[PDB]
């Protein structure tokens, strides 16, 4: 059976989205440089260690889906300089998203999260993303263009034995889900910095960690149209850190108004005909 | 032909949404009391007078759709005590919205706006709302439950001669739009405080002002699922005014996390498993 298409971020940039549109998945080799991976890991390290279980009884919005040993850290902008500067302004990411979401309009981050999977983590059941947060997406027409996509960026090696992601190629076009089986999957073997790109309709799952020793880490960036509400909020991110960002990064974090692709678009998150950034006089690229 | 169903807010509360679901429109008599209408008008009065044309070249997000003589004022919470307290906590509104959006989950305000139509304002073309801001909604399946609804509340008399709203009953179920004609419409004749409730699929239009003397005013409250992005932002609303609101009102204005109806919902606008209100220690019902 056919393996997941592997593409260069440097040379095959224009081919990435068309490949995902056709096959439902693609591996972007060296999506992030090893330098960026190093700084990202270093910066988020302590936050994953202090992170409680997904469904901790202390939590207001517990995640009852993730395995108890998994640790997920989101709202990365205040944590990571590498995230807020390098990945939020990624030329590759923005070309792909604009290719993907041009029919709808502006896009933003629905969630940027670092996930660390513990040794012996079981495989996730095969699934499509967004079904625990956006019931609306299930009511979209079969041939509706994807309203969100997910960059699954390896922050440590993804191998068959340590639970590399499974995908079913072509499953993003499936309506009948009777052929859903692990038999139909292929793996996303990836070095740190490589990214598996899927859509919200791609049937997939995290793999089983079978060594009992290896800890697998990833950065999952769900990019979606600005008409859909993010899973995470940046409302509590201090103004100085927000004002250190680029205007593009500010928009991605919901600290700007947004536009649809409607010919006479009237906009989203506006204030009496004016933008958030104009109204609040929000500065950009201010060193903190 | 059949007139728009008229229902009591006091006695027919449970009948309102089922009526709209069947017919695409209903008039809620005395949705707001004359007291509330009086205070709302008094409070927004100066803001509509200073409001520039919809597509003013000074604006960041000009509205090129509205007639040039129309004035629209949104982000009403900081303007109006009556809006932020009485209408945002309306028992009738919240019963209707929970009836309407239970399949999806939480709902919030997509836009609360006062609109003043000038004398001799032409009729709007027949349309469905949301097509200039949320292209996504057009891609929803025909029988998908409505993801937004619009309360068109009369703040002055709605008459046939001064441009009362037109609706086509049953048009919310239409797929073929060849029978779209003013021939098929009925009017929403309303006293101040009455509300015309429609869905995002109800074909309708503002009527022609034919007297050349009367100024018509309305409060349009588009309520929609929390999975859809609002047309307006409350990000710049001062913290003291936000903290004077009820928790329910805070949620409606995007100053709280939100929940979907998914059995193991993971939430919207959360912060590492905790809500906005918990994280920021947001107070409620603090007199200012
Ligand atoms: C144990 O098996 C699983 C675990 C997760 C999902 C799916 C999701 C999801 O739809 N959204 C995302 C997106 C990024 C990161 C996490 C999540 C997440 O939390 N869940 C629940 C399915 C099955
Ligand atoms: C001149 O004819 C028109 C004027 C408006 C619309 C429709 C909308 C709309 O879809 N959303 C709303 C919702 C509330 C209040 C205003 C608006 C609005 O601004 N437009 C553009 C159509 C036709
Ligand atoms: Br997991
Ligand atoms: Br994974
Ligand atoms: Br108008
Ligand atoms: Br109207
Ligand atoms: K699942
Ligand atoms: K129109
Ligand atoms: Ni997944
Ligand atoms: Ni309308």
XYZ file of C-alpha atoms and ligand atoms in Angstrom:
630
model
C 0.000 0.000 0.000
C 0.971 3.632 -0.639
C 3.090 5.463 1.952
C 2.441 9.026 3.128
C 3.839 11.504 0.562
C 7.031 13.227 1.761
C 7.678 16.791 0.603
C 10.393 19.413 1.036
C 9.422 22.628 2.814
C 12.150 24.380 0.794
C 11.443 23.119 -2.746
C 7.965 21.508 -2.835
C 6.111 24.330 -1.018
C 3.427 24.775 -3.701
C 2.846 20.984 -3.794
C 2.052 20.524 -0.090
C -1.619 21.535 0.092
C -2.586 19.935 -3.255
C -0.995 16.704 -1.956
C -2.990 16.839 1.303
C -6.171 17.724 -0.620
C -5.707 14.591 -2.768
C -4.382 12.071 -0.210
C -5.526 13.491 3.159
C -1.972 13.559 4.527
C 1.590 14.625 3.759
C 4.898 14.741 5.618
C 6.700 18.089 5.460
C 10.392 17.322 5.976
C 12.225 19.856 8.163
C 9.079 21.948 8.705
C 10.910 23.418 11.702
C 14.708 23.598 11.941
C 16.507 21.640 14.677
C 17.424 25.023 16.209
C 13.732 25.917 16.571
C 12.918 22.418 17.889
C 15.689 22.767 20.498
C 14.475 26.161 21.747
C 10.811 25.090 21.701
C 11.584 21.988 23.794
C 13.786 23.903 26.252
C 11.113 26.584 26.744
C 8.116 24.245 27.235
C 10.050 21.601 29.250
C 9.093 22.859 32.735
C 5.454 23.501 31.778
C 4.859 19.889 30.671
C 6.442 18.609 33.921
C 4.092 20.693 36.109
C 1.054 19.865 33.938
C -1.546 17.744 35.799
C -3.451 14.812 34.274
C -5.790 15.802 31.389
C -8.922 15.224 33.516
C -7.552 16.521 36.839
C -10.415 17.260 39.253
C -8.825 20.677 39.895
C -9.597 21.625 36.262
C -12.591 23.666 35.077
C -12.545 22.083 31.609
C -11.139 18.576 32.122
C -10.131 16.548 29.068
C -11.700 13.114 29.625
C -10.519 11.821 26.224
C -6.705 11.868 26.474
C -5.012 8.937 28.224
C -4.290 9.730 31.886
C -0.498 9.568 31.407
C -0.527 12.104 28.537
C 0.401 15.741 29.175
C -0.901 18.561 26.968
C 0.249 22.183 27.252
C -1.495 24.885 25.200
C -1.481 28.729 25.117
C 2.204 28.566 24.177
C 2.716 32.242 23.218
C 3.536 33.374 26.794
C 5.736 30.274 27.343
C 7.847 30.109 24.193
C 9.759 32.790 22.274
C 10.434 30.218 19.540
C 6.699 29.516 19.179
C 5.495 33.123 19.194
C 8.192 34.376 16.789
C 9.412 31.516 14.578
C 6.465 29.102 14.195
C 3.626 31.692 14.244
C 5.421 33.526 11.388
C 6.387 30.328 9.526
C 6.414 31.101 5.795
C 5.658 27.435 5.050
C 2.693 27.288 7.446
C 1.171 30.512 6.101
C 1.526 29.501 2.437
C -0.204 26.172 3.198
C -3.008 27.792 5.226
C -3.689 30.465 2.578
C -3.776 27.702 -0.065
C -6.119 25.707 2.184
C -8.521 28.388 3.446
C -8.783 30.937 0.590
C -12.410 29.990 -0.168
C -13.406 30.884 3.429
C -11.108 33.839 4.207
C -8.789 34.538 7.144
C -7.496 31.701 9.320
C -6.090 31.535 12.853
C -4.779 29.101 15.483
C -7.566 26.928 16.898
C -4.962 25.328 19.156
C -1.185 25.242 19.436
C -0.268 22.548 21.952
C 2.780 20.568 23.002
C 1.841 16.976 23.825
C 4.103 14.540 25.646
C 3.157 10.863 25.524
C 4.444 8.674 28.357
C 6.123 5.285 27.898
C 3.632 2.463 27.158
C 0.967 4.951 25.991
C -1.742 2.988 24.153
C -2.716 3.806 20.580
C -5.598 6.246 20.226
C -8.759 4.938 18.612
C -8.988 5.878 14.929
C -10.766 9.204 14.588
C -11.284 12.571 13.002
C -10.312 15.646 15.036
C -12.718 18.416 16.174
C -15.528 16.059 17.322
C -15.100 16.939 21.035
C -15.239 20.726 20.512
C -16.990 21.611 17.227
C -20.173 19.556 16.627
C -20.891 22.022 13.775
C -18.211 20.442 11.543
C -20.097 17.116 11.387
C -23.032 18.970 9.766
C -20.888 20.311 6.891
C -21.541 18.937 3.400
C -19.268 15.996 2.361
C -17.432 18.040 -0.298
C -17.102 21.220 1.792
C -13.492 22.440 1.805
C -11.690 21.574 5.059
C -12.344 24.237 7.724
C -9.347 23.180 9.825
C -6.028 21.366 9.371
C -3.539 19.944 11.872
C 0.262 20.175 11.736
C 1.605 17.346 13.886
C 5.206 18.431 14.326
C 7.675 15.911 15.769
C 9.648 17.365 18.703
C 11.303 13.965 19.221
C 11.704 10.958 16.877
C 8.492 9.303 15.630
C 9.129 5.563 15.123
C 6.926 2.514 14.556
C 7.888 1.082 17.958
C 7.430 4.323 19.966
C 3.943 5.128 18.614
C 4.328 7.201 15.441
C 1.017 8.506 14.055
C -1.207 6.284 11.894
C -3.209 7.688 8.973
C -5.582 6.166 6.434
C -4.810 7.796 3.080
C -7.911 8.985 1.207
C -10.036 8.718 4.377
C -10.709 12.478 4.316
C -13.051 11.744 1.367
C -14.823 8.818 3.111
C -18.517 9.023 3.990
C -19.044 5.320 4.752
C -16.854 4.485 7.783
C -17.229 0.678 7.746
C -13.746 0.052 6.286
C -12.166 1.888 9.247
C -9.452 -0.462 10.495
C -5.815 -0.351 11.607
C -5.281 -2.708 8.637
C -5.779 0.298 6.332
C -3.228 2.619 8.002
C 0.291 3.777 7.189
C 2.769 5.374 9.615
C 4.296 8.844 9.902
C 7.939 8.011 10.596
C 9.527 11.391 11.294
C 12.679 13.055 12.581
C 12.444 16.005 14.980
C 11.288 19.036 12.957
C 9.319 17.006 10.403
C 5.556 17.592 10.363
C 2.609 15.380 9.468
C -0.130 17.546 7.951
C -3.720 16.256 8.025
C -7.215 17.710 7.615
C -10.125 17.572 10.060
C -11.583 14.716 7.948
C -8.410 12.567 7.811
C -8.955 9.378 9.828
C -5.905 8.838 12.028
C -4.570 7.995 15.488
C -1.565 8.266 17.761
C 0.329 4.968 17.789
C 1.035 2.550 20.628
C 4.249 3.140 22.574
C 5.673 -0.407 22.699
C 9.222 0.044 24.086
C 8.189 1.023 27.625
C 11.138 3.445 27.777
C 10.722 6.168 25.123
C 8.911 9.465 25.698
C 7.406 10.927 22.518
C 6.755 14.669 22.171
C 4.952 16.678 19.506
C 3.727 20.173 18.717
C 0.187 20.015 17.327
C -0.895 23.178 15.510
C -4.564 23.123 14.517
C -5.065 25.922 12.001
C -8.656 26.802 11.132
C -10.815 29.460 9.527
C -11.414 32.587 11.620
C -15.162 31.829 11.493
C -14.584 28.914 13.914
C -13.900 29.489 17.621
C -10.477 28.388 18.933
C -10.189 25.581 21.484
C -7.831 27.842 23.463
C -7.901 31.486 24.573
C -5.120 34.082 24.519
C -7.263 36.628 26.431
C -5.057 36.345 29.535
C -1.738 36.710 27.644
C -0.109 39.952 28.915
C -0.259 42.992 26.606
C 3.555 43.413 26.476
C 4.058 39.891 25.054
C 1.179 40.451 22.582
C 2.706 43.791 21.506
C 6.072 42.057 20.887
C 4.425 39.950 18.159
C 3.998 40.684 14.462
C 0.547 41.808 13.245
C 0.129 38.386 11.585
C 0.918 36.570 14.850
C -1.444 38.913 16.735
C -4.260 38.001 14.321
C -3.556 34.261 14.725
C -3.961 34.605 18.511
C -7.291 36.472 18.323
C -5.777 39.877 19.126
C -7.014 41.368 15.851
C -10.195 41.518 13.791
C -10.658 38.941 11.026
C -12.007 38.897 7.468
C -14.109 36.429 5.488
C -13.722 35.784 1.747
C -17.197 37.214 0.974
C -16.887 39.822 -1.851
C -18.373 42.561 0.380
C -17.085 41.069 3.646
C -18.291 42.933 6.765
C -15.711 41.259 9.020
C -15.415 39.381 12.307
C -14.587 40.678 15.808
C -15.001 44.292 14.666
C -15.913 47.329 16.766
C -18.422 49.648 15.061
C -16.722 49.357 11.655
C -13.168 49.483 13.045
C -10.716 46.716 13.913
C -9.575 45.593 17.375
C -6.011 46.681 16.589
C -7.109 50.153 15.415
C -9.573 50.679 18.284
C -7.206 49.587 21.074
C -4.185 51.177 19.323
C -2.363 47.850 19.543
C 1.375 48.114 18.839
C 3.399 45.382 17.119
C 7.009 44.133 17.136
C 7.906 45.976 20.359
C 10.940 44.345 22.025
C 10.131 43.403 25.643
C -51.651 33.715 2.607
C -50.631 32.907 6.192
C -49.461 35.739 8.464
C -46.448 35.527 10.783
C -47.416 33.657 13.985
C -47.757 35.976 17.002
C -46.870 34.588 20.429
C -46.863 35.825 24.021
C -43.499 36.002 25.781
C -45.371 35.463 29.067
C -47.639 32.507 28.208
C -46.429 30.902 24.943
C -42.714 30.717 25.877
C -42.348 26.987 25.134
C -44.112 27.454 21.759
C -41.766 30.114 20.349
C -38.853 28.029 19.046
C -41.036 25.163 17.736
C -43.039 27.811 15.828
C -39.883 29.321 14.286
C -38.538 25.833 13.494
C -41.755 25.063 11.571
C -42.489 28.421 9.886
C -39.093 30.193 9.847
C -40.464 33.221 11.707
C -42.510 34.303 14.717
C -43.424 37.581 16.398
C -42.796 37.679 20.150
C -45.191 40.283 21.551
C -43.691 42.475 24.293
C -40.306 40.721 24.104
C -38.924 43.806 25.858
C -41.027 46.030 28.127
C -41.645 49.662 27.138
C -39.490 50.633 30.146
C -36.526 48.708 28.708
C -37.184 50.120 25.213
C -37.213 53.658 26.658
C -33.904 53.235 28.509
C -32.261 51.440 25.566
C -33.238 54.253 23.172
C -32.148 57.004 25.581
C -28.761 55.336 26.145
C -27.914 54.626 22.474
C -29.400 57.907 21.123
C -26.141 59.911 21.041
C -24.098 57.008 19.639
C -26.332 56.608 16.562
C -26.155 60.384 15.915
C -22.327 60.396 15.913
C -22.145 57.174 13.859
C -20.644 57.736 10.374
C -21.940 56.131 7.166
C -21.603 52.303 7.090
C -18.781 52.441 4.504
C -17.025 55.575 5.803
C -13.487 55.794 4.388
C -12.235 56.406 7.948
C -13.311 52.838 8.849
C -11.030 49.787 8.980
C -13.895 47.372 8.278
C -16.382 49.348 6.167
C -19.847 47.893 5.589
C -20.439 48.263 1.836
C -23.806 46.457 2.005
C -25.984 48.729 4.174
C -27.628 51.729 2.495
C -25.556 54.898 2.966
C -28.250 56.616 5.069
C -28.482 53.711 7.554
C -26.704 53.908 10.915
C -25.621 50.779 12.799
C -24.190 50.815 16.330
C -22.812 47.596 17.843
C -20.770 46.666 20.965
C -23.661 47.955 23.080
C -22.515 46.628 26.489
C -20.367 49.704 27.303
C -23.099 52.050 25.967
C -26.281 50.697 27.535
C -27.086 49.585 31.089
C -30.461 48.330 29.832
C -28.752 46.159 27.197
C -26.035 44.697 29.419
C -28.379 43.945 32.346
C -31.948 43.474 31.083
C -31.670 42.105 27.519
C -28.483 40.008 27.985
C -30.212 38.268 30.939
C -33.610 38.017 29.203
C -35.329 34.846 30.433
C -37.288 34.663 27.163
C -34.181 35.012 24.978
C -32.251 32.366 26.926
C -35.106 29.832 26.892
C -35.426 30.256 23.101
C -31.663 29.996 22.491
C -31.293 26.882 24.680
C -34.251 25.328 22.819
C -32.618 26.316 19.520
C -28.960 25.417 20.117
C -29.033 22.392 22.477
C -27.749 20.016 19.768
C -24.603 22.172 19.353
C -23.960 23.385 22.922
C -23.334 26.861 24.341
C -24.439 29.965 22.442
C -23.384 33.621 22.549
C -24.021 37.009 20.915
C -22.687 37.122 17.351
C -23.877 40.727 17.184
C -26.088 43.033 19.221
C -26.690 46.173 17.170
C -29.048 49.132 17.141
C -29.962 50.098 13.578
C -31.646 53.352 12.611
C -33.140 53.571 9.126
C -33.513 57.055 7.643
C -36.656 58.368 5.937
C -37.085 57.051 2.360
C -34.753 54.092 3.035
C -35.203 51.575 0.201
C -36.191 47.976 0.873
C -33.288 45.565 1.256
C -32.977 42.835 -1.342
C -34.419 39.525 -0.130
C -31.705 37.526 1.595
C -30.452 35.201 4.269
C -28.214 36.677 6.980
C -24.574 35.655 7.666
C -23.479 35.581 3.983
C -21.149 38.611 4.348
C -19.296 37.256 7.408
C -19.604 33.450 7.646
C -19.109 31.694 4.271
C -18.945 28.443 6.304
C -22.726 28.462 6.908
C -23.470 28.060 3.176
C -21.576 24.732 3.258
C -23.799 23.278 6.015
C -26.134 20.416 5.089
C -29.727 21.484 4.173
C -31.255 19.877 7.289
C -28.533 21.023 9.712
C -30.081 22.728 12.748
C -29.811 26.532 12.559
C -26.438 27.722 13.913
C -27.663 31.293 14.434
C -30.953 33.147 14.932
C -31.835 36.846 14.804
C -34.125 38.758 17.176
C -35.271 41.865 15.317
C -36.644 43.940 18.172
C -38.717 47.022 17.315
C -37.467 50.137 19.146
C -40.045 52.228 17.263
C -43.267 51.236 15.437
C -42.903 48.853 12.470
C -45.624 49.638 9.896
C -46.255 48.668 6.272
C -45.693 52.263 5.125
C -42.499 52.899 7.161
C -40.685 49.723 6.040
C -41.597 46.904 8.435
C -39.637 43.683 7.823
C -40.711 41.229 5.107
C -40.376 37.463 5.563
C -41.191 34.464 3.386
C -42.686 31.810 5.672
C -41.196 28.337 5.163
C -38.230 29.796 3.236
C -35.799 28.528 5.896
C -36.438 25.037 4.438
C -35.951 26.140 0.793
C -33.067 24.788 -1.283
C -34.330 25.953 -4.691
C -34.408 29.783 -4.600
C -36.276 30.411 -7.879
C -39.590 31.275 -6.170
C -37.875 34.111 -4.258
C -40.116 37.131 -4.807
C -41.660 39.986 -2.824
C -44.964 38.416 -3.952
C -44.330 35.603 -1.444
C -43.683 37.817 1.616
C -45.678 38.819 4.681
C -44.951 41.767 6.996
C -43.832 42.045 10.619
C -46.133 44.782 11.910
C -44.868 45.446 15.431
C -45.167 47.827 18.364
C -42.047 48.966 20.230
C -40.834 46.017 22.339
C -42.184 43.342 19.985
C -39.572 41.123 18.322
C -39.476 39.294 15.001
C -37.473 36.085 15.431
C -35.926 34.478 12.334
C -33.217 31.911 11.583
C -30.111 32.328 9.429
C -31.974 30.475 6.629
C -35.176 32.582 6.723
C -35.433 34.634 3.521
C -36.351 38.196 4.472
C -35.663 41.907 4.004
C -36.070 45.320 5.573
C -39.019 47.122 3.986
C -39.156 50.345 1.986
C -39.704 53.536 3.983
C -42.444 55.217 1.912
C -43.592 58.170 4.075
C -40.408 60.241 3.718
C -40.814 61.423 7.326
C -40.583 58.439 9.707
C -37.343 57.167 11.245
C -37.428 53.450 12.072
C -35.184 51.967 14.776
C -34.496 48.378 15.793
C -32.285 46.281 18.040
C -30.984 43.264 16.117
C -29.627 40.491 18.342
C -27.966 37.700 16.367
C -27.562 34.763 18.739
C -25.367 31.904 17.542
C -23.502 28.828 18.713
C -20.237 29.482 20.562
C -18.417 27.507 17.839
C -18.985 30.435 15.432
C -16.982 33.669 15.698
C -18.942 36.844 16.550
C -19.198 39.696 14.045
C -18.289 42.067 16.898
C -15.627 42.099 19.622
C -15.951 42.985 23.308
C -12.155 42.781 23.840
C -11.900 46.554 24.376
C -14.819 46.756 26.859
C -13.329 47.937 30.200
C -12.892 45.303 32.933
C -15.082 47.184 35.464
C -18.122 47.109 33.134
C -17.453 43.417 32.339
C -17.182 42.626 36.074
C -20.551 44.355 36.688
C -22.240 41.733 34.483
C -23.681 38.351 35.418
C -21.638 35.231 34.553
C -24.193 34.439 31.817
C -23.810 37.915 30.284
C -20.007 37.616 30.531
C -20.146 34.339 28.575
C -22.389 35.895 25.894
C -19.798 38.651 25.341
C -16.838 36.260 24.982
C -15.454 36.963 28.464
C -15.745 33.308 29.482
C -14.878 29.876 28.119
C -17.573 27.976 26.214
C -18.792 24.380 25.974
C -19.972 22.194 23.100
C -22.691 19.533 23.393
C -20.214 16.689 22.691
C -20.589 13.988 25.419
C -16.912 14.357 26.430
C -16.659 18.033 25.442
C -13.124 19.470 25.766
C -14.342 23.076 25.526
C -13.677 26.314 23.659
C -11.487 29.297 24.622
C -9.910 27.332 27.483
C -6.497 27.840 29.082
C -4.658 24.571 29.795
C -7.802 22.816 31.067
C -9.128 25.848 32.972
C -11.652 28.513 31.997
C -10.996 32.183 31.192
C -13.042 33.248 34.222
C -11.140 30.915 36.585
C -7.705 31.766 35.153
C -8.169 35.556 35.177
C -10.156 35.431 38.457
C -12.967 37.356 36.774
C -15.523 38.768 39.226
C -19.237 39.104 38.446
C -22.130 41.370 39.490
C -19.841 44.043 40.978
C -21.650 47.412 41.125
C -19.607 50.103 39.330
C -7.304 8.991 23.369
O -7.793 9.072 22.060
C -8.091 10.261 21.488
C -7.487 11.430 21.901
C -7.772 12.650 21.307
C -8.682 12.721 20.302
C -9.011 14.000 19.640
C -8.971 15.249 20.155
C -9.334 16.363 19.273
O -10.233 16.172 18.534
N -8.677 17.511 19.313
C -7.388 17.631 19.712
C -6.487 18.334 18.938
C -5.174 18.476 19.337
C -4.719 17.921 20.499
C -5.622 17.245 21.268
C -6.921 17.082 20.888
C -7.801 16.339 21.842
O -7.620 16.627 22.987
N -8.725 15.487 21.434
C -9.559 14.849 22.390
C -9.248 11.539 19.866
C -8.984 10.324 20.468
C -28.953 46.549 2.003
O -29.353 45.207 1.997
C -28.846 44.313 2.878
C -28.345 44.712 4.099
C -27.842 43.801 5.015
C -27.815 42.477 4.713
C -27.292 41.474 5.663
C -26.342 41.628 6.612
C -26.013 40.466 7.445
O -25.985 39.422 6.896
N -25.768 40.597 8.739
C -26.268 41.595 9.506
C -26.879 41.303 10.708
C -27.383 42.309 11.507
C -27.304 43.620 11.134
C -26.679 43.901 9.953
C -26.186 42.923 9.142
C -25.507 43.381 7.891
O -24.809 44.338 8.045
N -25.635 42.741 6.742
C -24.927 43.201 5.601
C -28.360 42.084 3.507
C -28.843 42.989 2.582
Br -3.433 10.254 24.222
Br 0.261 11.437 17.325
Br -30.159 49.063 5.090
Br -35.711 45.245 9.240
K -12.539 9.056 19.392
K -27.960 40.469 -0.294
Ni -6.213 13.318 16.296
Ni -31.288 40.457 7.236
